[PDB]
Design a protein around this ligand. Structure first.
Ligand SMILES: Nc1nc2c(ncn2[C@@H]2O[C@H](COP(=O)(O)OP(=O)(O)NP(=O)(O)O)[C@@H](O)[C@H]2O)c(=O)[nH]1
Ligand SMILES: [Ca+2]
Ligand SMILES: [Ca+2]
Ligand SMILES: [Ca+2]
Ligand SMILES: [Ca+2]
Ligand SMILES: [Mg+2]
Length: 166
């Protein structure tokens, strides 16, 4: 079966782990344990295709930024996550995309921009602002809540659909 190597990236605290764990394990992680780098692997059927998803849940803590090159080299598609209640995290996306672009020497890397924590009302990043950023990268923008599971499958399975278009 086809394996998809997905990598979840973005600033600390944006919900990368909660998103991944919601997808793979169907519960919401309420606590905040910063990640170094974790791997998850699950067989799923996406659009009739039995798929192995290999998901790398990466560090948002800037102290671990030296690890980015390695994971950007091996990843096939990237979920670029910010939180809609964290303007800085949205502004941080570009450093992630620019590095992905550099490492893969490509302006056409499979990516999805994810505005997470869409269950929270303290929104400082409007959907349209994020749509505009995604448009500039040629990628979809999807809002998610790891808490309620809104958009979670859509974000990941879409990443897959973007990889398939490559
Ligand atoms: N309300 C709400 N809280 C969320 C959501 N996603 C994550 N959180 C909360 O935000 C905090 C950080 O989530 P976490 O997944 O650990 O973030 P991370 O991006 O993996 N952090 P790190 O980069 O340090 O590994 C946790 O308390 C978690 O419950 C969401 O969609 N909604
Ligand atoms: Ca919980
Ligand atoms: Ca692009
Ligand atoms: Ca504003
Ligand atoms: Ca397309
Ligand atoms: Mg994490």
């Amino acid at each position: 079966m086809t394996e998809y190597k997905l990598v979840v990236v973005g600033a600390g605290g944006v919900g990368k782990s909660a998103l991944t764990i919601q997808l793979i394990q169907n519960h919401f992680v309420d606590e905040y344990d910063p990640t170094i780098e974790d791997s998850y692997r699950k067989q799923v059927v996406i659009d009739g295709e039995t798929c192995l998803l290999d998901i790398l849940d990466t560090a948002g803590q800037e102290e671990y930024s030296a690890m980015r090159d390695q994971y950007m080299r091996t990843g096939e598609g990237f979920l670029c996550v910010f939180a809609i209640n964290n303007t800085k995290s949205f502004e941080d996306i570009h450093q992630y995309r620019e590095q992905i672009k550099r490492v893969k020497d490509s302006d056409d890397v499979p990516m999805v921009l994810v505005g997470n924590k869409c269950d929270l009302a303290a929104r400082t990043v409007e959907s349209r602002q994020a749509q505009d950023l995604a448009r500039s990268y040629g990628i979809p923008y999807i809002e998610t809540s790891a808490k309620t599971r809104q958009g979670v499958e859509d974000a990941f399975y879409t990443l897959v659909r973007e990889i398939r278009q490559h």
